[PDB]
Write a protein that binds this ligand. Structure first.
Ligand SMILES: Nc1ncnc2c1ncn2[C@@H]1O[C@H](COP(=O)(O)OP(=O)(O)O)[C@@H](O)[C@H]1O
Ligand code: BEF
Ligand SMILES: [Mg+2]
Ligand SMILES: [Zn+2]
Ligand SMILES: [Zn+2]
Lengths: 291, 10, 683, 48
């Protein structure tokens, strides 16, 4: 019931499937999918992978879980969730994050562990998938593949400095000091036309305070691909990764990395006349995991 | 907010 | 009505729409209707492109006229005004689209699921409005009309997945038949469906071009679409939803890239062939626009006959030069016919199967394919065999440790001036699907080029290399090899022995891929060969470079009473009749030869134990022979393991030539014979 | 040498609830009043 618009994802069903996969994953399944059953271990394969990982996550206190998508392919009940994850990055990733938080708090509660749930529910957990299929290069990504998980490998040529990214504006009313904080949604900030107070109403009382806004890290990394396959007469191509938050300042120049993330496209403004955008979209990649 | 009926497709 | 007058024109779009619909429904010549079956395949999400064959339309017209029924000239109308008929065909198809028989199975493209969601939503809106108006209780045709007038559906432009393209008339069956040079594409041809024959120069990489940007108003829960048909557009900020427009409540829009419509975009910039340029002029280029599933079909250094609509575009040049409504033009590509079939596109269908059978069943494939290379050249049989082996190429091995072997041959044609060396390079250029003819010192002064320019369409810097990168998976016929400077020789060192180019100049730290077979032709030192000097001094090639060449023919010029009179007879006959003299064999035209070569390239033969023993013994004997005469008058160079590798490569190529997956002992014997007789003319 | 670009629209999801003061709701109420007012068990306004 209740699939989201423009997608094939149902929140309840996807959360159910992800919880099922978390509860009942054993590495022997991946061994079966790898046709490596002759290497099946009695110890590690028996033990529940992600439950244990969530445990050491709880004791250590980390907030990020790295998920192998081929493990999702291994589990029969979540084979469809794999394709749902490729085709719909952001929605399914948020679903996974909520499910991780739910599983953490549930596991604490069920065992009645002395560890307090104050930190757990306040924390924000992130899921970082990887090993999501093949590479296919960048010459072979058609525009229909916008906002999908892609796997890229190459050499990190150049790394820009840290670029602050606005998260909350801090407009201040000059007249009645009505300092409202505006969160950014879908990269848009909406100015109060007049003073949001009813008693005080002065449109010119607003003057954004740059310094008291809350920002977030953003680093652009120039990656030159080294695809496993190269078409005839194709010189190497450079793509612009865009990392966020903790991944900033992680990848140094000269590192040979394999990166997975969301293949995005953004209009580029023709600066000849302001607020006029070119019809050709620039393509870049948001980064979720770096190996 | 974006929730719609499931009869659209499968 | 006075401001915008009217003109009566012979075309009637309604009658032509009826003709289009009838043609789509009732064309059977190619059990069921061809285009109905194609539409069914499209509905099942198999085909994304509908190719409207104009020859089918012509045959439909001929059938209708032959039986006596009057059918208007649809083909002529399409050729005269192609752009409008694209939308006419698109709407006719959209009316006649069948329904899918295979639903979404969680593995379908996100575009397909979005289209299905939109279709179901607008159908639900239509039915709901019908139910409401029927329940109001104020014929179902009037009800349908009022509900379709009163509802805001997703337009049919946003519920089609297929792409529409026109195929021009074949010349043999029959304007679009006759290809035109860029020079002849005048201003009279705008809006027509023309065929431009030329060589593709500079193809940009695929980038998404937005067609219908889609927004969402969170307040009113609508989705507003803004069509874009310009190189530049202005984004929307205030809601255009009718209900949200009347409501005075503030609304804000947001871009939804997943909801917006995109088309794969590419620009190609075809030039003129050298033959088309009139005397004294230089070739000039013409932009090509590629949209939809036609992208990646055009590559630099391709001889093609692109058929497309010659649409104009608003001028973007200087206002001073603009005097009037000046417009810059382009050709929206519709059909691409490669003049030379690539080797990587080969497919063993019956069409190639019958001719391949015809070649092999007649037998003597090796001799026929060797003689068929430049039949006007006389008496140079061994070098022709070597060039054929160059065309076929050996097998490249990739050991699991990461070790890689070339699997490609390199032939050097040393020789006295006037022995038709440069002619064979041009013949190979005309046979090979890809190739570059570099020559001299000034020309192609940098075969390796560390060029990083800017792409005009996309601001991101692209890397450009010399002829070597353009000759990827091809033959880089190099002429006047000895006169080439030392820098290009050092680059060609790596290009021959490996298949990569390593660049560490200012701005570029990369490694280009050039798996190119080098074919060279250079004169010996001091012009002609001097038998006083040692052969290794006449060649003037350092042992590091000389080892790379698998076969290095000497092709010395020595007068003879018999051979020269035979050659004179051959050349004089060629000048008299523009044909190969003898009637013993008919030469294989480059199309058939290229097809057979592709078929042979498909095979990957493997060596044999006894074959391996024979090759090992031969290599040992050759090494001993080189050691013995290390300073004799005939020291053609000490043998190296590259000689063994070249023997293996030649044997594999010869095996490929017979269409065999198993290397034969006689093939190794013939390869040894060729390697030995490459220097036989020295005596 | 280009045609003017169109601007479509379509309702997709149920947004915020239509307020009573909303003009569309006023029009809907008026239309229902015209179509459903009954006097002497007669649709006076519809027939008029
Ligand atoms: N064996 C031959 N068969 C046909 N033409 C020949 C032959 N040898 C020389 N010629 C002619 O002599 C000229 C030399 O051509 P070219 O290929 O430029 O010579 P090279 O590059 O060896 O100096 C051409 O006109 C060519 O047709
Ligand atoms: F005189 Be030739 F071009 F080798
Ligand atoms: Mg020459
Ligand atoms: Zn105030
Ligand atoms: Zn709105």
């Amino acid at each position: 019931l209740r699939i989201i618009w423009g997608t094939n994802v149902s929140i309840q069903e996807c959360t159910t499937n992800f919880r099922n996969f978390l509860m009942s994953f054993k590495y022997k399944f991946r061994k079966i999918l790898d046709e490596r059953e002759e290497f099946i271990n009695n110890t590690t394969d028996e033990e529940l992978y992600y439950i244990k990982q969530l445990n050491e996550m709880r004791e250590l206190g980390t907030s990020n879980l790295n998920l192998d998508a081929r493990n999702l392919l291994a589990y029969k009940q979540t084979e469809d969730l794999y394709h749902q994850l490729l085709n719909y990055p952001q929605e399914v990733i948020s679903i996974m994050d909520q499910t991780i938080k739910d599983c953490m708090v549930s596991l604490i509660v069920d065992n009645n562990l002395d560890y307090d749930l104050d930190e757990i529910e306040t924390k924000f957990y992130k899921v970082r998938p990887y090993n999501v299929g093949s590479c296919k290069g960048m010459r072979e990504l058609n525009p229909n593949d916008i906002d999908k998980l892609i796997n890229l490998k190459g050499l990190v040529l150049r790394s820009t400095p840290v670029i602050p990214d606005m998260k909350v504006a801090f407009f201040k009313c000059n007249v009645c000091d009505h300092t409202m904080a505006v969160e950014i949604d879908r990269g848009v900030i909406q100015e109060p036309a007049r003073c949001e107070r009813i008693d005080c109403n002065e449109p010119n009382s607003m003057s954004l305070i740059h310094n008291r806004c809350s920002f977030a890290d953003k680093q652009v990394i120039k990656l030159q691909e080294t695809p496993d396959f190269v078409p005839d007469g194709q010189t190497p191509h450079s793509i612009s990764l865009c990392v966020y938050d903790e991944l900033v300042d992680s990848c140094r120049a000269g590192d040979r990395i394999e990166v997975t993330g969301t293949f995005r496209s953004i209009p580029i403004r023709a600066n000849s006349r302001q607020r006029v955008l070119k019809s050709l979209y620039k393509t870049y990649v948001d980064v979720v995991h770096v190996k | 907010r974006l929730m719609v009926d499931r009869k659209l497709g499968v | 009505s006075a401001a915008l007058p009217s003109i009566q024109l012979p075309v009637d779009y309604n009658n032509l729409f009826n003709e289009i619909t009838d043609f789509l429904v009732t064309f059977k010549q190619d059990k069921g209707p061809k285009y109905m079956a194609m539409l069914q395949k499209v509905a099942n999400r198999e085909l994304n492109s509908v190719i409207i064959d104009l020859d089918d339309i012509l045959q439909y017209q001929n059938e209708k006229f032959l039986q006596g029924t009057q059918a208007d000239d649809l083909v002529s109308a399409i050729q005269q005004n192609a752009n409008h008929f694209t939308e006419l065909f698109c709407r006719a198809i959209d009316n006649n689209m069948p329904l899918p028989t295979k639903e979404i199975d969680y593995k379908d493209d996100v575009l397909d699921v979005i289209l299905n969601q939109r279709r179901l939503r607008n159908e639900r809106m239509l039915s709901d409005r019908t139910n409401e108006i029927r329940s109001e209780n104020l014929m179902n045709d009037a009800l349908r009309e009022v509900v379709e007038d009163e509802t805001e559906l997703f337009p049919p432009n946003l519920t089609r997945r297929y792409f529409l393209y026109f195929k021009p008339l074949s010349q043999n069956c029959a304007i679009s038949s006759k290809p035109l040079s860029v020079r002849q594409i005048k201003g009279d041809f705008l809006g027509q469906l023309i065929t431009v024959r030329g060589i593709i120069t500079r193809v940009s990489d695929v980038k998404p071009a937005v067609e219908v940007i889609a927004y969402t108003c969170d307040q009113c829960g609508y989705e507003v679409f803004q069509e874009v048909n310009s190189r530049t557009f202005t984004p929307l900020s205030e809601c255009t939803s009718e209900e949200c427009s009347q409501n005075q409540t503030k609304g804000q829009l947001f871009m939804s890239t997943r909801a917006s419509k995109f088309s794969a975009f590419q620009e190609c910039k075809i030039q003129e062939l050298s033959q088309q340029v009139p005397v004294g002029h230089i070739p000039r280029s013409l932009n090509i626009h590629v949209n939809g599933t036609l992208v990646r079909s055009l590559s630099p250094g391709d001889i093609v006959d692109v058929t497309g609509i010659f649409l104009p575009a608003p001028y973007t040049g200087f206002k001073a030069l603009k005097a009037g409504l000046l417009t810059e033009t382009y050709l929206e590509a519709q059909f691409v016919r490669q003049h030379k079939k690539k080797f990587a596109s080969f497919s063993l269908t019956s069409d190639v199967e019958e001719r391949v059978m015809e070649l092999i069943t007649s037998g003597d494939v090796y001799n026929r394919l060797a003689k068929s290379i430049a039949p006007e050249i006389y008496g140079n049989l061994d070098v022709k065999k070597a060039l054929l082996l160059l065309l076929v190429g050996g097998v490249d091995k990739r050991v699991g440790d990461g070790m890689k072997i070339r699997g490609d041959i390199n032939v050097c044609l040393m020789g006295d001036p006037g022995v038709a060396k440069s002619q064979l390079l041009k013949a190979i250029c005309k046979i090979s699907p890809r190739g570059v003819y570099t020559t001299g010192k000034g020309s192609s002064g940098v075969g390796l080029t560390a060029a990083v320019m800017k792409d005009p369409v996309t601001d991101e810097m692209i890397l450009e290399g010399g002829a070597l990168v353009l000759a990827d998976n091809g033959i880089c016929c190099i002429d006047e090899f000895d006169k080439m400077d030392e820098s290009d020789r050092t680059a060609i060192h790596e290009v021959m022995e490996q298949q990569t180019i390593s660049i560490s100049k200012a701005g570029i730290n990369t490694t280009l891929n050039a798996r190119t077979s080098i074919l060279a032709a250079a004169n010996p030192l001091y012009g002609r060969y001097n038998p006083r000097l040692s052969p290794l001094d006449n060649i003037n090639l350092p042992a590091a470079l000389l080892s790379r060449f698998d076969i290095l023919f000497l092709m010395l010029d020595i007068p003879s009473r018999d051979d020269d009179e035979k050659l004179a007879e051959h050349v004089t006959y060629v000048h008299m009749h523009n044909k190969q003299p003898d009637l013993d064999f008919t030469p294989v035209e480059p199309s058939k030869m290229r097809e057979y070569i592709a078929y042979a390239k498909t095979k990957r033969p493997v060596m044999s134990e006894a074959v391996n023993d024979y090759v090992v013994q031969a290599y040992i004997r050759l090494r001993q022979d080189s050691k013995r005469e290390m300073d004799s008058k005939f020291s053609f160079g000490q043998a190296t393991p590259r000689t063994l590798l070249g023997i293996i490569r030649l044997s594999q190529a010869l095996a490929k030539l017979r269409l065999a997956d198993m290397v034969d002992i006689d093939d190794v014997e013939e390869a040894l014979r060729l390697v030995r007789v490459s220097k036989e003319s020295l005596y | 040498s280009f045609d003017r670009p169109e601007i479509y629209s379509a309702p997709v999801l149920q947004g915020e609830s239509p307020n009573d003061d909303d003009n569309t709701e006023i029009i809907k109420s008026f239309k229902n009043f015209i179509l459903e007012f009954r006097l002497d068990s007669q649709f006076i306004y519809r027939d008029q």
